[model samples]
Target chain A: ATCNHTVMALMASLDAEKAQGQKKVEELEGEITTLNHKLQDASAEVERLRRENQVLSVR
Target chain B: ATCNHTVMALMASLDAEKAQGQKKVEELEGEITTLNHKLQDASAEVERLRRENQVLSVR
Candidate 1:
């Protein structure tokens, strides 16, 4: 039937989109993880610099 | 046909997964954007502190 054929085609399209969306999610998840690590490092550096400044002022 | 039924079921599953994946991606993207803004602010704060410290030492 023509309607059946259309249904099948739509299903195929949905499947493709799903696959693409899943892949994008994985990629973004990885990027977020990397960014989180960078933020932690940056925070640590800032703290270190602050301490260094305090010591310098004490002298 | 039984094969057609199976196909339909599989298509439905794929569609659900795709929707779920898309929603997750959007959520993660929002979080990432917020994190990026925080990181930028932190970096700025660090720079300001460093400059202040330098001025203090010079005096």
Candidate 2:
């Protein structure tokens, strides 16, 4: 009975570790998405700036 | 003796799982770094564009 208890505890620990790892990955993914969104917005802004600047140069 | 063997197997499995988790975290961290670097570069580009555009407007 004692050995079984020990095994059960060990299994529980493994489950906890696995869940923590999943959370870590999910957090990182979320951060990456945020960065990508910012970059996309910046890209659009830069494109607009370049076009406007080009128009002024022509005028 | 049998119970000892079972425990040993369980322990080894735990170790393997821990190592796998470590690798997964490292991979995600590396991905995040790449994204961060891209964002940094994009930020710089945007700033440069803003300054250049202001100059063109003034001219």
User: How many clashes in candidate 1?
Assistant: 0
Q: Write the per-residue lDDT of candidate 1 for residues B1-59, one digit (tens) a residue.
A: 76577667767877687778778888999989988997898888788878888888887
Q: Write the per-residue lDDT of candidate 2 for residues A1-59, one digit (tens) a residue.
A: 88888888888988888899889889988988888898888878888887887898876
Residue B11 C-alpha lDDT in model 2 = 89
- Clash pairs, model 1 backbone: none
In candidate 2, stretches whose alpha carbon ends up further than 4 angstroms from where it belongs are none
Give the clash count for each candidate: 0, 0
How accurately is candidate 2 docked according to DockQ? Answer: 0.72
Per-prediction TM-score to the true structure, in the order listed: 0.77, 0.89
TM-scores of chain B, in order? 0.87, 0.93
Cα lDDT tens digits for candidate 1, A1-59: 76577667767877788778868988998988988888888788789888988898886
